[PDB]
Amino acid sequence: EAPAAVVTGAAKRIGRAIAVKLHQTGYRVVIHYHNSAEAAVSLADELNKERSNTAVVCQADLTNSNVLPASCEEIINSCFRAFGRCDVLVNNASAFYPTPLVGKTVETQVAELIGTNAIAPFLLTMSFAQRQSSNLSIVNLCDAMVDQPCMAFSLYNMGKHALVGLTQSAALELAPYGIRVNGVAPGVSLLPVAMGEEEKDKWRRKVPLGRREASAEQIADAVIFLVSGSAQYITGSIIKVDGGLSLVHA
Amino acid sequence: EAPAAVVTGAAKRIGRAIAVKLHQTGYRVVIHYHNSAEAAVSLADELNKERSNTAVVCQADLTNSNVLPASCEEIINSCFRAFGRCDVLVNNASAFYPTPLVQGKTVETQVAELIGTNAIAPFLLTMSFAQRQSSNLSIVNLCDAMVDQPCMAFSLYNMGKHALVGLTQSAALELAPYGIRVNGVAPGVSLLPVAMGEEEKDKWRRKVPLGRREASAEQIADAVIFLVSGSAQYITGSIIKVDGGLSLVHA
Amino acid sequence: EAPAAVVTGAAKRIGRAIAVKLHQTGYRVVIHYHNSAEAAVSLADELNKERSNTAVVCQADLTNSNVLPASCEEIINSCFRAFGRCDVLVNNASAFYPTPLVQGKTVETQVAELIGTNAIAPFLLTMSFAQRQSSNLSIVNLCDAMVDQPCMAFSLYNMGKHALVGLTQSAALELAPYGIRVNGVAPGVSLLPVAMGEEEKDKWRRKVPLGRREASAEQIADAVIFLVSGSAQYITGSIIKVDGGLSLVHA
Amino acid sequence: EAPAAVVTGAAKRIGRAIAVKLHQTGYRVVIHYHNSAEAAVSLADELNKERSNTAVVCQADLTNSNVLPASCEEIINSCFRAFGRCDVLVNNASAFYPTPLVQGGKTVETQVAELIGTNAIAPFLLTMSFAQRQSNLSIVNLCDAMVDQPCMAFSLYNMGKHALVGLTQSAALELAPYGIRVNGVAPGVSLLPVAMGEEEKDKWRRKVPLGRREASAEQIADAVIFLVSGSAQYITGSIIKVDGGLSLVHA
């Protein structure tokens, strides 16, 4: 039977590309989304056209709250309900915006930034593991620039740092169950919609390898390697896919 | 007049030794505490016996919730209220317990406690500290030398301490233009947990290359003192391991 | 026309597994060796029996000396002589033995071998590789996942593997504009030393969270093949651990 | 009895400041120099003027060669000859210049010998000699906060500073049972190279978050003083950045 993967925030951009590549590799997919219903459904329909009954969607807010553990259990459960199994979890969904130290309240910002980037991945990991020639693994989308952060992104950066912790802690704890846990750490990949080209170019010009951002597919390629049979000894590793950006001094 | 410092979880163990050593150095101190009211009040008495009106206690839960920001604001406000200034913040308070991934508090409570005390409260305290501001302003965060070689089944804790590294770095960057330095001190094995059995304590002691023993609370405090001092005025974003070489030892 | 690769120390163990996998992927290969001539020739024979004129051997000492630069130039030149191009360089050859700080070979010989093979020869091979240059050019350095948790009394070996991390990063930066990617693969416990008895092997195996066993040579080679592939064309300056979680395990 | 310290490359700049502060703290000092004899003697004269027979000079090239081990043994021996003891070793001497990988005075192997010898091999040999000849004993290695974000075309220098991180960590582990602590101080931008253009100096200064200026030599020395002190007696294998946040600033 075909293996199955959950990809969070999979309606657009990197998560979409990850879902597509997994599908092309032979996985059935749960496309998790928050607000982007039309795009999630569009993707599911495209994937099911290619092969019937191989893609479903699952809506959830991954903001931290009292109901987050249940929402996370329900995402994993939907993979088991659709496909009978859950082999791969990709923690991709992420809130990203500034929170300077000096209309959303700060606790709402905490909930969203820390919930999406850290707590939801932890809860999803718990639910994934509890539900367990297998090749089980988790891939967390990290940040190559986590030790050279953008100015005034404290909470975002804290979330991504916590995600490195999770990757390492879960790699250690789940290794006896045969579940590998790794990361992929983009530098500059797809830039924000509507960011002016002139500002995109300030970031692009910093990248040693080609003075361009990573495509979503280039990020997805590293995810594919990590879930593959060619990575069966690899756990707790975080692979930068950054064109050398992180090596560049100020 | 004398500078002033806030130390969180300062009623006992490492936080107490930090508060003591700051006070010996010249600081007026806010002794924050959660449950350890008797020990906090007793420390404030000891320090005030040495120099009157140089210590106050301040009670707060640093578990994450919708009122955590107000609580953190109030800790900083309590230093200004007692002393008219706030020069140093030491983020020492910390929950520490296992949260296994695979099968009596709820998981949401565990998240709130472990992530709140180790990460969110230091963030909010840092915000309130900066907002309220010769001078030598700085923050010291109590980190963990074993953050990349964590205890088995401590994912939430480890996540909190990793986030604390991120905060230390991010706040060092953002607050540098205001002359506020932000650094860390990362113990390996120091005062063993009260609940840990004697055999397990001896197991941990035996892992430490430099002396086969735990760091004293005073040894940790010595590093905090250095970082807040005039001898550390160009140091920001640095995390100093005080671990006797423990983090260097392979499995 | 098929691309071509140089693998240093390729007569056996991990270097052989890398050359075999590259050859299976469609590369022509230069099998560098130092003392292991029989094994090297035996490998070239096997690969050439599979596809004619696709493997050659190349002998060189990679100990540091005043002629090491000429030796490294000649290794690269051997790939151009055989195959008319050189797309991939794998720096695998390595001396590995203790050098106690307190107490056969003179210390300067130990420096020349340990630092030469692990760091200086990779540097010179990298210079020659770059100087001699649809296309997918890259270099892969065999690093060590335990570089920050080293074996006791292996100072010079550890210094050499640390230098190799530096080269990997420096070379990635400097050669990015030429389209040459520079990455590493960092084993933890893979094939154990021939001189190690089974009991000592089992002590190391038991340390590994993922399966309590060493990485196969093929498992190491798999990570090399990825980094040289089209699937890694935005990856440069990255060191991939292939260690089964070993580096995450505390003392 | 006053403790004694060896400081390599102590005639000028950061090494001079380290020698001065150690001396001011109560140490007797060996001022090592290569080319700067006039300056080394001028320093010694100044220090002996404060306290008679507390400063001596010691000449040596620290370029790697057949004779480097003997030269390093004699640097340590000079401290025991002058003062009867050797408590502290500061590995400060360093060659620093570019070594491009791609080319359009020195042979590349001479560059290897200077850059890797001064920054890594001489520190290793001085460490062996220091430990062999053996209280608050420690070693401090001058590292580089930008070791993972290196200057373009400085591969060999960077390899040497990476190897020094390895030595710091390896020696911390191996010498801990002897009570010898081994730590590092990692500047970012401190005293700018004398041959750097003034416009290039201001470009580096403007990058620094904490004050948009370089560290003074004394602010670097302050961190050395902490690490050798009784306030750091549980600290080994630690590298303290003194970089004003520079290493945290993205491209």
Ligand SMILES: NC(=O)c1ccc[n+]([C@@H]2O[C@H](COP(=O)([O-])OP(=O)(O)OC[C@H]3O[C@@H](n4cnc5c(N)ncnc54)[C@H](OP(=O)(O)O)[C@@H]3O)[C@@H](O)[C@H]2O)c1
């Ligand atoms: N792009 C880059 O350059 C870059 C750089 C470094 C790291 N990364 C990381 O790589 C991953 C993918 O990057 P990306 O740029 O493609 O991400 P993105 O577009 O910023 O976010 C991906 C998705 O996250 C979901 N999300 C946001 N808030 C959510 C919430 N409260 N609950 C549930 N889902 C939520 C959204 O789903 P809906 O649209 O359905 O609402 C969104 O489409 C992220 O983890 C990101 O942090 C990206």
Ligand SMILES: NC(=O)c1ccc[n+]([C@@H]2O[C@H](COP(=O)([O-])OP(=O)(O)OC[C@H]3O[C@@H](n4cnc5c(N)ncnc54)[C@H](OP(=O)(O)O)[C@@H]3O)[C@@H](O)[C@H]2O)c1
């Ligand atoms: N001891 C070690 O070996 C070691 C190792 C690595 C890192 N560290 C770090 O160094 C610091 C000091 O360690 P330690 O062992 O002295 O700490 P500890 O005794 O575990 O905790 C210090 C204090 O934190 C406070 N605290 C706990 N939960 C709290 C909450 N919800 N709200 C407010 N305060 C709370 C407690 O105050 P009350 O008693 O008043 O309730 C406690 O006394 C901690 O950050 C720790 O993680 C220690």
Ligand SMILES: NC(=O)c1ccc[n+]([C@@H]2O[C@H](COP(=O)([O-])OP(=O)(O)OC[C@H]3O[C@@H](n4cnc5c(N)ncnc54)[C@H](OP(=O)(O)O)[C@@H]3O)[C@@H](O)[C@H]2O)c1
């Ligand atoms: N095995 C592991 O568990 C492990 C762990 C961490 C890192 N690594 C790294 O991964 C790589 C492969 O490991 P391995 O165990 O397969 O290596 P290895 O067997 O120890 O050495 C591979 C080859 O290095 C060559 N070599 C040694 N000294 C040389 C010299 N002076 N000049 C030229 N070549 C020389 C030898 O060639 P001849 O036989 O032709 O003389 C040898 O066959 C190495 O870089 C190693 O440091 C391995």
Ligand SMILES: NC(=O)c1ccc[n+]([C@@H]2O[C@H](COP(=O)([O-])OP(=O)(O)OC[C@H]3O[C@@H](n4cnc5c(N)ncnc54)[C@H](OP(=O)(O)O)[C@@H]3O)[C@@H](O)[C@H]2O)c1
């Ligand atoms: N300045 C900075 O911004 C900075 C930044 C990062 C790291 N660092 C590190 O901090 C330390 C001090 O920096 P600095 O700028 O003061 O150093 P420096 O002036 O570049 O060098 C200090 C001394 O090294 C000695 N030296 C050079 N080559 C030598 C050789 N072949 N044999 C013996 N001695 C030799 C010289 O002694 P003579 O003059 O007697 O010949 C020189 O005066 C160095 O380790 C450096 O790498 C400095």
Ligand SMILES: N#Cc1c[nH]c2nc(N)nc(N3CCSCC3)c12
């Ligand atoms: N868009 C988007 C991001 C989603 N997660 C990100 N994380 C970082 N560290 N940077 C980001 N960007 C702003 C700097 S340039 C690369 C894009 C993003």
Ligand SMILES: N#Cc1c[nH]c2nc(N)nc(N3CCSCC3)c12
């Ligand atoms: N008490 C306490 C701790 C507070 N934060 C800690 N962090 C770690 N990684 N270990 C700890 N300990 C368990 C190992 S032995 C020393 C104590 C503690």
Ligand SMILES: N#Cc1c[nH]c2nc(N)nc(N3CCSCC3)c12
């Ligand atoms: N053989 C071999 C090694 C080549 N480079 C190595 N580097 C380390 N840190 N360990 C190694 N080993 C000793 C620990 S068990 C696996 C082998 C080797």
Ligand SMILES: N#Cc1c[nH]c2nc(N)nc(N3CCSCC3)c12
């Ligand atoms: N002098 C001197 C240096 C000795 N080691 C150095 N390492 C780095 N990474 N930068 C340096 N400088 C050039 C950049 S500006 C600060 C000085 C030096």
